[PDB]
């Protein structure tokens, strides 16, 4: 049964990127998915995406430009202190500024650099590079 | 190999057989298209 919609969305995006598809369809949609995709967008890993409202969980169509090496979810959403953030970036990213680790904090969903700038912390959602 | 080759042979033969049957139907329909392009007692019984 569907446990993590975000995992399914990110895996579908990964398979589309691997196969070279220029656009991918994600069902069901969620606020967490939209925020995560917005972070990827801001960092340029994805382009435009459009949300289709069907009076149900909804759908998303994402255009892909081939700039995404990998995107994944860290399940379970571990609690992360500010000191621990560096450790996570050491485990999930091939290099030190290559990629981002995305955290859901009291100030919203943001990459680790923004969380450090704002001095906030929370749980970890995933990574993109 | 073994029994599996024999089963492969049968399916291929059936597939080949189907192609011949279908081509016959296409040939016949073409003939019908070309055909379409180009005693008092019997008339009373023509309906039968």
């Amino acid at each position: 049964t569907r446990s993590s919609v975000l995992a399914d969305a990110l895996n579908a995006i990964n398979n589309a990127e691997k196969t070279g598809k220029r656009q991918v369809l994600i069902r069901p949609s969620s606020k967490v998915i939209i925020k995560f995709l917005q972070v990827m967008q801001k960092h340029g890993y994805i382009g435009e995406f459009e949300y289709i409202d069907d009076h149900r969980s909804g759908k998303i169509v994402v255009q892909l430009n081939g700039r995404l090496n990998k995107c994944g979810v860290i399940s379970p959403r571990f609690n992360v202190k500010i000191g621990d953030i560096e450790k996570w970036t050491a485990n999930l990213l091939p290099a030190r500024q290559f990629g981002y680790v995305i955290l859901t904090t009291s100030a919203g969903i943001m990459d680790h650099e923004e969380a450090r700038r704002k001095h906030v912390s929370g749980k970890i959602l995933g990574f993109v590079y | 190999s073994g029994l599996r080759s024999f089963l492969r042979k049968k399916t291929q033969n059936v597939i080949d057989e189907r192609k011949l049957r279908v081509q016959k139907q296409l040939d016949k329909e073409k003939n019908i298209r070309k055909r379409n392009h180009q005693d008092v007692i019997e008339e009373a019984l023509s309906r039968f």
Binding site: Q23, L25, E50, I52, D54, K59, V61 | -
Partner: protein
């Protein structure tokens, strides 16, 4: 090549009801006129019951596996 966001209308018509971009029913409703009484009654396309004219108690359709078969002599319009 195809645009998932703006699919062709013919393409979606071929797809299953639930597999389209926004799922919706392929069924419809009908204005069926009673033969005996000439009154008009609404009948669901895939009706599961033998719809009878209220005035005359005459069967208008008979249920089937899919679309209900309208009784002989009953005229109909899509509403």
């Amino acid at each position: 090549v195809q645009d998932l966001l703006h699919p062709t209308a013919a393409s979606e018509a071929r797809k299953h009801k639930l597999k389209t971009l926004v799922q919706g029913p392929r069924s419809y409703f009908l204005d069926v006129k009673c033969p005996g009484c000439l009154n008009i009654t609404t009948v669901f396309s895939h009706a599961q019951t033998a719809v009878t004219c209220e005035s005359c108690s005459t069967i208008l359709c008979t249920p089937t596996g899919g679309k209900a078969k309208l009784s002989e002599g009953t005229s109909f319009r899509r509403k």
